[PDB]
Amino acid sequence: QDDATKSLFESIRVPQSAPLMASLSGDYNLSLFETPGNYRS
Amino acid sequence: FVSQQLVRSEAAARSSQLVKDKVNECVKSQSSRNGFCGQGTHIVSFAVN
């Protein structure tokens, strides 16, 4: 289970990321997926 | 032991389906989706025993 979790999270990771688009871009209100203690959305 | 053999048979059947999919996707052709045929952007894949 530990090795499966590690492999799954290694396959999850993206090479590029744009964290500014979560709430500081676009007219859409998708703040439910905005990371702000807890770092979950 | 019989129950263990049955559970391992189900796991082997699922893995056999996965091997069929990987052979028909990554070996005979070049994949488009990432992550399925290993890490990075796929170039070529070889399957051995």
General description of the model:
The structure is cut from a larger assembly and holds 2 copies of chain A. With about 40 residues, chain A is an all-alpha fold. Chain A has 1 helix and no strands. The chains hardly touch. It is classed as viral protein.
Give a brief outline of the structure.
By secondary structure, the first copy, chain A, is an all-alpha fold. Helix content of chain A is 27%, strand content 0%. Chain A is built from one helix and no strands.
Q: Major sheet of chain A: size, sense and barrel closure? A: none
* Helix content bin of chain A: 25-40%
Q: Termini separation of chain A (Å)?
A: 26 Å
In percent terms, what proportion of residues of chain A is strand?
under 5%
The helix/strand order of chain A is H
Indicate the structural class of chain A: mainly alpha
Gross geometry of chain A:
elongated
The number of helical segments of chain A is 1
Total strand segments of chain A: 0
What Rg of chain A is obtained from the alpha carbons, in whole angstroms?
A: 14 Å
The oligomeric status of these chains comes to part of a larger assembly
